[PDB]
Amino acid sequence: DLRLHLLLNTSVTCNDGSPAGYYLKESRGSRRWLLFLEGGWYCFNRENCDSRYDTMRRLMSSRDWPRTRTGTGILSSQPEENPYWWNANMVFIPYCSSDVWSGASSKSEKNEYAFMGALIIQEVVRELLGRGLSGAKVLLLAGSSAGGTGVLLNVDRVAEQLEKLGYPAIQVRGLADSGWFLDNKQYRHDTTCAPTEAIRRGIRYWNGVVPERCRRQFQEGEEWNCFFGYKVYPTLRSPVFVVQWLFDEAQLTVDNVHVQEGLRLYIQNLGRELRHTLKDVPASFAPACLSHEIIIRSHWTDVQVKGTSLPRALHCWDRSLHPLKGCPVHLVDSCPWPHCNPSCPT
Template sequence: LLGTVLLGARRFRGGRNPQPRRAPPSPTYRERGDTTESFPLDFTAVEENMDNFMKQVKNLAQSLYPCSAQKLDYDMKLHFLENSSVTCNDGTPAGYYMKESLGSRRWLIFLEGGWYCFNKENCDSRYETMRRLMSSSKWPQTKTGTGILSPLPEENPHWWNAHMVFIPYCSSDVWSGASAKTDQSGYAFMGSLIIQEVVKDLLTKGLDKAKVLLLAGSSAGGTGVLLNVDPVADLLERRGHTTVQVRGLADSGWFLDNKQYRSTDCHDTVSCAPTDAIRRGIKYWGGVVPERCRLAHLGEEWNCFFGYRVFPSIKSPVFVVQWLFDEAQLTVDNIHLTGQPVQEGQWRYIQNLGIELRNTLKDVPAMFAPACLSHEIITRNYWIDVQVKGTSLPRALYCWDRSFYDNSRNNKAPPKGCPVHLIDSCPWPHCNPTCPTIRDQFTGQEMNVIQFLMHMGFDVQKMAQQQGMDPSKLLGMLSSGS
C-alpha cells in the first residue's frame, strides 16, 4: 500500500487541479457504487511520517475518484442519548454529534465549553441569553468539525482519520453535575452523566474495538477533561474494555484560583472570584469530582476544578494546552481589556499571571503553552500555525502519541526533534510572533506586536531600561519576533 501511495503521489502531485473528464462508469460499476465500500485499514501503524502519508493518501484518492471525492460527507450528525433520563438543564434530551471513519481504531470525543452558572438567578439569565448552552431544543441536525475535529488532513494532519464525536455543552456545570431537575433548582445538572452515557452509546457503535480514545475539550470543556478522563477510563475498565487507551487533551481549562486584580461582589461568573463561583456551583449542581482528588481535598472538593490541584491525582495521560495569558482567566481576575491602555498595575498583574501559570505547568510532562493573549485553540482553523520553540501543536500531539508507541516497544529515548514539553519563556503577551492575530476592539484593524503592546500601555523606554538595552534595539527585537 505504501509503495502504491508513494508512486501515486508522484504521478498525481498537484492532484487538486481539475482532472480530465472520464467516461461514465458502466451500469455494473454504478450498481456496486450504490453501497458504501469500506477498507478496514488501521493507519495508526504508520508512525514514521504520518502527516505526509495521510496527505498522500487523500491526494491519491481524490485523483483516482474526483467525482466521489466531491460527494464526501464531512459533517457530524446529531444523535440523542439512548437513556432519555439524562438531560440538558431544561429537561430536553442530551446528545452528541458523530462522524464515523471506517477502518480507524482511534476515537476523539470533544467536550464543548461555555462558562457556567451557579445559582437560580444567573442560570435564569443564562437560559434567556444563551439557551443553546442549556437546551437541545434548537440544535441543528449536523455540525462541521474544525481544527482537531476537521476531517481534512491539511487542517488536521494527525487526527483527521479518527471517529469524531462532539458533545454539546448543555449542563452549565463544568461537566461535573449528577443531579436531576428539582423544583428548588429549576434545572438538571448532569454534565458528568452525559459523558458517561455518550461513552456507553458509542460502545455499541464501535468504540469497544478502539485502540485509543482521546477525551478533548476547550475552556469549561478543558476543565471537564481533567474531571472526567479517569472516570471514563474506569467505566471502560469496568465493562471489560481494558485494551482501549484513554488519554486527555485539556485546552484552555487550566484555571488558577488566584487573587483577583480588583475584588468585586459575586453576582455572576464574570464578577465572581473563581473560587467563590466554584464553591457555590459545586453545591448547586450536586457536582462530582474524581475519587482520588476528592480524597485529597475532603470537604474542599472545589479544589479539583483547578488544573494544578487536580492534575497530580489523574492516572490517565493528559496533554495540557494553555495560553499563558488566557483571556477568560483575565476576565474572572477583573482585568478587562476595553481598548484603553492598561494601567501600570494591570500590566504588572498580566505579566505575573504568565509567571504563575508557568510555575503551575512546570511539572506537567506533556504541554503546549504559548505566550499569547487568547482563549481556546484546538478547534480553531489556525491551530496549526501557532508554534512554541519552532514546534506546532499538531506536531507536539503527534510526538506525544509517538511516545506511547515507542514506550510500548521499550524504546525509552524520545525521537529527536519531537518535543512534548513546550512552554514560552518570553515575559509578555504576544511576544511569540506566531500568536493569533489581534484586532483593535473598536476599529477592527489588525495590530502587529509593537502596536499591540503600545495599545496595552507598554512603555518601551522603561522596559528597555529594565532589560539593560537601548530602546531602538528592543523595538527591533520585538519587530523581528525575537
C-alpha cells in the same frame, strides 16, 4: 459533517429536561476515537441560570440544535486542516448542563434545572460502544475552556467505566485546552463573585462530582479545589496533554483585567505563575499569547513554540506513548509579555 444523535436514555438531560446528545462522524478504517467537550462558562443559582436560559438557550437545551455540524480543527477529516488525527472517528458533545461537566442531579419537584454533565459523558460512552467504540485502541477525551476543565474532572472516570465494562485494552487519554485556571488574587476586587466562590456554590447547586483521589485529599467542603488544574492534575492516572495560553482571556476576565506599572507587573506575574505550574507537566503546549481556546479553530495549525506546531506536538505525544530526537512534547514559552511569540493569533 457530523450527524446529531439524541441519547436513547432520555433520563440523561440538558438543563431544561430535554435529551442531551452527541454529533458523530465514523471512520470505519480507524481504531482512534476523539470525544470533544464544548465549553461556555456556567451558572450557579436560580437567578443567573434563568438569565442564561433567556439568551444562551442552546447551552441549556437541545430543542433548537441543528441536525448536523461541520468538523473544524482537530475535528476536521481533511489532512490539510488536521495533520494530527484526520482519519479518526470524530465526536462533538454539546455543553448543555452549565456545570463545568461535573453535575449529577435531575430536574425534580425541588430542582428547576437538571445538572447532569458527568452523567452525559458516561452515557455517550455507553451508547458509542455499540457503534464501534468497542473496537477502539485509543479514546482521546478533549475539550476547550469549561470543556478543558471537564476533561480534567472526567478522564479517569471514563477509564474506570471502560475497565469495569470489560474493555481494558482501550487506552483513555485526555487533551485539556484553555481549562487550566489559577485561583489567584484579582487585579481589582452578585454574579462580583470570583470563580473559587462561584464553584463552591455551584458544587452544592449541581450536586457536583470530582475525581476520587483529589476528593480524598481535599475532603468535604473543599472539593472546589479540584476544578483548578495544578491541584487536580497530580492526582490523575490517565495521560493528559495540557494546552494553555499564558495570558488566557477568560483568566484575565475573572481577574477583572480589561498599560502602567501596576498592571504591567500583574500581567508579567500571571505569566510567570502559569509557567511555574507547568514546569513538571511533561506533555504541554503553552504559548505567550493573549487568546482563548484553539483546538477546534480552523487556523490551529499556525501557532508554534520553539518552532514546533501544536499538531506536531500532539503527534510527538502519540509517539512517546508507544525522548524523541526533534519531536518534543513539553513546549512552554519563556518570554514574559503577550505576543512576544510572533506566531500568536492575530
